[PDB]
Amino acid sequence: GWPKHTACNSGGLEVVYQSCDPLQDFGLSIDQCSKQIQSNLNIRFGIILRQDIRKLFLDITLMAKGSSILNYSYPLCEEDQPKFSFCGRRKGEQIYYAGPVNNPGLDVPQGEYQLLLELYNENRATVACANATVTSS
Ligand SMILES: CCCCCCCC/C=C/CCCCCCCC(=O)O[C@@H](COC(=O)CCCCCCCCCCCCCCCCC)COP(=O)([O-])OCC[N+](C)(C)C
Ligand SMILES: *[C@@H]1O[C@H](CO)[C@@H](O)[C@H](O)[C@H]1NC(C)=O
Ligand SMILES: *[C@@H]1O[C@H](CO)[C@@H](O)[C@H](O)[C@H]1NC(C)=O
Structure with a gap:
């Protein structure tokens, strides 16, 4: 049960996540957070790969007040x-990515919103998993 981490908390937007991979935690931070999210957010993401x-x-998966808002699935590479x-x-391999998301x-x-982010490979193996809470105030 990996500890909660703040990905960002500024300008009326707080994003807190917890790794849901039983093997490991990872690092994620988001640059320039605010209630008005800019297009192409810059992130910093650090992880040791446990799968090829x-x-x-x-x-x-985005939810609020116990209801589904949206489901999203996209090939990254x-x-x-x-x-x-x-x-x-x-x-x-220990990876550090500092760059935009699109x-x-x-x-x-x-x-308040709940977010579940699942990164996985060609074999449906979990590479990273995070459940997150997003608070806009
Ligand atoms: C009704 C009210 C609605 C309000 C909703 C509130 C939600 C606010 C949440 C904001 C906080 C977001 C924090 C999560 C950061 C994830 C970035 C993101 O949002 O991810 C974004 C973008 O994802 C990407 O595609 C980024 C990938 C870029 C390709 C190359 C860069 C590689 C990046 C490496 C990726 C590592 C991922 C790290 C996370 C791992 C966790 C296991 C998802 O976008 P979305 O669903 O609209 O597709 C976007 C809609 N279009 C597809 C039409 C544009
Ligand atoms: C992740 O989910 C667990 C169990 O559903 C929950 O206890 C925890 O508060 C969540 N973490 C975040 C950051 O939302
Ligand atoms: C998202 O998927 C869940 C099942 O995983 C489903 O209950 C929900 O209705 C879906 N939401 C939308 C908006 O399609």
Whole structure:
């Protein structure tokens, strides 16, 4: 039960996450958080890979007040597509990524949201898992 970590807390937006991979914790921080999220947020993401990656996928589950808002699923890479990606990385490699994610800008309405982020490979193996709480105030 990995401890809660603040990914960011500024400008009326707080994002706290907990790793849900039983093997390990990881580092995630978000630059320039605010209630008005800019398009293409910059993040810093640090993890030791516990699976090999030929293809990588990201699923996001967004909920609020016990109800589903949205489900999202997107392929991040296949080996060398794009070339600058985690694909081709292997078990035991320690990765640090500092760069944008390709989100739309969003003015987050005041309230609390629950987010589940699941990163997995071509074999449906969990590479990273985080459940998060987002508070817009
Ligand atoms: C009704 C009220 C709605 C309010 C909702 C409130 C929600 C606010 C949440 C804000 C906090 C977000 C914190 C989570 C950070 C994740 C970034 C993100 O949002 O992820 C974003 C973007 O994801 C990406 O595709 C980024 C990948 C870029 C490719 C190369 C960079 C590699 C990045 C490495 C990825 C590592 C991921 C790290 C997380 C691992 C955890 C296991 C998901 O976007 P979304 O669902 O609209 O697709 C976007 C819609 N389009 C697809 C049309 C644009
Ligand atoms: C993650 O989920 C667990 C169990 O559902 C919950 O106790 C915890 O508060 C969640 N963590 C965050 C940061 O939302
Ligand atoms: C998201 O998927 C869950 C099941 O995983 C489902 O209960 C929910 O209705 C889905 N939400 C939407 C908006 O399609």
